[PDB]
Amino acid sequence: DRINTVRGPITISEAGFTLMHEHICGSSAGFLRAWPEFFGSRDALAEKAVRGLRRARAAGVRTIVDVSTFDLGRDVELLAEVSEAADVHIVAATGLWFDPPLSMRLRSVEELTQFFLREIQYGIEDTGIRAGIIKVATTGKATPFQERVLRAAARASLATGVPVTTHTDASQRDGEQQADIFESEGLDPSRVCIGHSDDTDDLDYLTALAARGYLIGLDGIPHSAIGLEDNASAAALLGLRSWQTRALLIKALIDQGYADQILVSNDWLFGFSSYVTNIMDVLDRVNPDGMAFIPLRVIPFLREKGVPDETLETIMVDNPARFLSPTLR
Amino acid sequence: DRINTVRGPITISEAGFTLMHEHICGSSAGFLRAWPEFFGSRDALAEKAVRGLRRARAAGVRTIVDVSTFDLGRDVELLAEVSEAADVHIVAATGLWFDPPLSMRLRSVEELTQFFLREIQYGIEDTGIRAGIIKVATTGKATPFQERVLRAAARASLATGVPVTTHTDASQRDGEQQADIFESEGLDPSRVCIGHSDDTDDLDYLTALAARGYLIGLDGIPHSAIGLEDNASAAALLGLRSWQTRALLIKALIDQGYADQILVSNDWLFGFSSYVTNIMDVLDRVNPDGMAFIPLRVIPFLREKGVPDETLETIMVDNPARFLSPT
Ligand SMILES: [Zn+2]
Ligand SMILES: [Zn+2]
Ligand SMILES: [Zn+2]
Ligand SMILES: [Zn+2]
């Protein structure tokens, strides 16, 4: 009944209002240390993150889960610095996203399990900071390597009780294959969040996953390139569905009886080197509220659409607490 | 005038016997810091490196050029530590190899140039250690991104006088395209070494590059899977040609008049996370001399084949001094 944060162990009740899928910075391993001027400076990136998290805190956020892996250039010392300055708890992730270097892509299930367990049980790098979640990814049918990662992540979660959260291409229904592999491994679905599930309108796909016991990550609510259809890179990243369309899936899953199984987030960030240059000007145009978009815009939207307060609090406070608390079931 | 090393500037004459294409550790960016246990420990990797460099130093080596880039997991603090304990100069590299992550792959020629220039003119990470060479790579026909890396490398070289050195798939004569792209940016061939050129017996290919003024990197002389050909991953890394066969290309380019354009090395390492697990067990059986292989085995072999000591001196001392001097 402790959750590891970048500033150490917290009790479950200190987590409070939680954003389960976010990033301080979306980058690549070693990149922030090797070319900090890409973001202006390391301090400029940190200050920008602190401004954004302080705003999110003022709107009610107390914890974000940063699901940046090794290969997304997770820098836990940055995360501790930003956490302390903004007085927002940050949970760090182990696992791998879909840009693993050779030194990872050539590893066995056993080797990957050791690496994830290291980051949970011992610490990340030389920092003593322990991960509180495992992040994995597919983009369509799993590559052989991605299957090995799913299996290593299941093994790490069985050994530690730490949960797994996933990147999907929701248009390819990637959750069904991820689910199959987790269930062959023996991982309980209540320890798994199928992410980017708000990228699709296929409610049959989502209820069938929630029927099997999975948590459903509706985690990119503000992602929309509506108004910027002529920006190809921005439309490929954000899609042409509205924030309201995404948000209404939250209502839709409540209405199907699965309020218990929803996790809601922004999937935002304060820098993004692992995409096209200047993407942050597009993102900050699209959603100037940043990580404060869920509490400032989506919570009131869901209320005016009929969702009880009590339900929003189970989704933003109780679901995340239940999910993050280390347990096998 | 001055060459940058991981322990600061040295004068040209301090370089001495120089291995122009080596590695302390072949890895991936951030990997040694995130999982040092893959190598046993950071201490165990440093111990083995210090032992191998001291082995090389005893055989006459004074300087190595570690052509590990960002994406090969170059750790210049490790390089500094082993350089100092072994009393061997290490020149560090900028550039990109063929495992760039997205944060590099999506960058323009102009962005890449700024990055390379940072590592040459300011420093690597927060260390103040500056690169003395630019490493680039193709594996066959250049991808669009690798063409951008070659162009950024040429611009960084023209701005600083620092030389460029390449990875090739020699069986696809990559040096030909590399040379065209460099010349299109105005880079002089005398600032370029076309590497892994000993990976095939293709002297038409090598002499024509050398006739255009390129330096030819015969840099994998001890690489051979002969005797362990049934190990598929060893054979794919090391090839099925003997070290003597590779070394005879050195004699061949000398015989053709190109002694002034040859650079010889081992392309060795002491750890290797960017290949299959336990590869070091194979490598240490194939070439236990490590980075001492050139001075202990190749030099005497070439002497016995009639190459003069003065030609061996120009190749191992003079050619690297001229190549590394910023121009
Ligand atoms: Zn994702
Ligand atoms: Zn994300
Ligand atoms: Zn190479
Ligand atoms: Zn090499």
Q: What is the CATH number of the domain that holds B41?
A: 3.20.20.140
Centre of ligand 2 to C-alpha A22, Å, is 6
What is each CA distance from A38 to A35, A98, A242, B111, B152, in whole angstroms?
Answer: 6, 22, 31, 9, 16
* B 5-24: CB under 8 A from A: none
Q: What 3 state SS string does chain B have? A: CEEEECCEEEEHHHHCCEEEEECCEECCCCHHHHCHHHHCCHHHHHHHHHHHHHHHHHCCCCEEEECCCHHHCCCHHHHHHHHHHHCCEEECEEECCCCCCHHHHCCCHHHHHHHHHHHHHHCECCCCECCCEEEEECCCCCCHHHHHHHHHHHHHHHHHCCCEEEECCHHHCHHHHHHHHHHHCCCCHHHEEECCHHHCCCHHHHHHHHHCCCEEEECCCCCCCCCCCCCHHHHHHHCCCCHHHHHHHHHHHHHCCCHHHEEECCCCCCEECCCCCCHHHHHHHHCCCHHHHHHHHHHHHHHHCCCCHHHHHHHHHHHHHHHHCCC
CB A90 within 8 A of CB A6: yes
Quote the CA–CA distance of B311 and B313 in Å, as a whole number.
5
Experimental method of this PDB entry: X-ray
Contact assessment for residue A178 and residue A140, using Cβ atoms and an 8 Å cutoff: no
Residue whose structure tokens are 């440093």: B46
CB proximity list for B45: less than 8 A, separation 6 or greater: B25, B32, B36, B39, B78, B270, B271
Sheet with strand A89-91: strands edge to edge: A18-22, A63-66, A89-91
- Maximum distance among all Cα pairs of chain A, rounded to whole angstroms: 51
CA distances (Å), origin A288, targets A20, A270, A281: 20, 11, 10
- Report the relative pairing of strands B2-5 and B8-11 from DSSP bridges: antiparallel
Task: Find residue B135's DSSP bridge partners.
Answer: B95, B165
Across the interface, whether the CB atoms of B34 and A34 are under 8 A apart is answered no
| A89 annotated binding-site participant | no
Rounded to an integer, what distance in angstroms lies between the CA atom of residue A70 and that of residue A32? 12
3-state secondary structure of A241: coil
Rg (CA), chain A: 18
How far is residue B80 from each of residues B43, B85, B87, B126, B130, measured CA to CA in Å? Answer: 14, 9, 10, 14, 12
| Bridge partner residues of B271 (DSSP) | B25
Joined together, the tokens standing for residue A67 give 């699901």
In angstroms, what CA-CA distances link B234 with A102, B238, B279, B282? 17, 6, 8, 7
DSSP 8-state assignment for residue A278: T
Contact A198, A219 (CB under 8 A): yes
Alpha-carbon distance of A174 to A162, in angstroms, equals 22
* Joined tokens for residue A121: 């049980």
Cross-strand pairs, B216? B194, B262
Q: A17: which DSSP letter?
A: S
Task: Provide the CB-side half-sphere exposure for A153 (13 A, CA).
Answer: 32
Two structure tokens written together for A198: 């708000």
What would the DSSP string read from start to end of A174-199?
A: HHHHHHHHHHHHT--GGGEEE-SGGG
B249-286: b or e for each residue (b if 16 or more CB lie within 10 Å)?
Answer: bbeebbeeebbbbbbbbbbbbbbbbbbbeebbebbeeb
B102, B111, B274 member nearest A99 (Cβ): B102
Instruction: Write down the number of H helices and E strands in chain A.
Output: 15, 13
A273 touching B, CB under 8 A?
Answer: yes
Structural domain boundaries enclosing A44: 1-329
CB neighbourhood size of A24 (10 A): 33
SS3 of residue A26 by DSSP: strand
- Cβ pair B326, B1 in contact under 8 A: yes
Asked if A38's CB is within 8 angstroms of B103's CB, the reply is yes
- DSSP single-letter state for residue A217: E
Backbone angles phi, psi at A2, to 5 degrees: -130, 145
Q: Do residues A131 and A162 touch, judged by C-beta distance below 8 A? A: yes
Q: What are the helix (H) ranges across chain A?
A: 31-34, 42-58, 76-86, 102-105, 109-117, 144-160, 174-185, 203-211, 232-238, 243-255, 279-286, 293, 299-304, 309-313, 319-324
Q: How far apart are CA A102 and CA B72, in angstroms?
A: 9
A133: its two tokens:
């979640």
Instruction: Output the CA–CA distances (angstroms, integers) from residue B199 to B168, B170, B218, in the order listed.
Output: 9, 6, 8
Tell me how far apart the alpha carbons of residues A229 and B28 are, in angstroms, rounded to a whole number.
37
Tokens of B265: 């090395």
Residues of B in contact with A34 (CB under 8 A): 29, 70, 115, 119, 124-125
- Residue in the block written with tokens 């899609």: A239
CA A137 – ligand 1 centroid, Å? 7
Q: What is the CA radius of gyration of chain B?
A: 18
Look at A33 and B99 and tell me if their CB atoms are within 8 Å. no
Q: Which residues in chain B have Cβ-Cβ distances shorter than 8 Å to A276?
A: 106
d(C-alpha B237, C-alpha B233), whole Å = 6
Please give the single-letter amino acid code of residue A245.
T
The kind and range of the H/E element at A5 are strand A2-5
Closest chain B residue by Cα to residue A26: B103
Q: How far is CA B314 from the centre of its chain?
A: 18
**Chain A environment of B76 (Cβ under 8 Å):** none
Question: What is the spatial distance between Cα A299 and Cα A56, in angstroms, rounded to a whole number?
Answer: 13
Q: How close are the terminal C-alpha atoms of chain B, in Å?
A: 9
Distances (CA, A) of A234 to A284, B62, B309: 12, 52, 63
CB of A219 within 8 A of CB of A20?
Answer: yes
Quote the DSSP letter at residue A124.
S
Query: What are the phi and psi torsion angles at A167 (to 5°)?
Result: -90, 130
Number of domains in chain A: 1
8 A C-beta contact, residue A133 and residue A3: no
- d(Cα B309, Cα B191) in Å, to the nearest integer? 26
Q: Does B43 show up as a binding residue in the annotation?
A: no
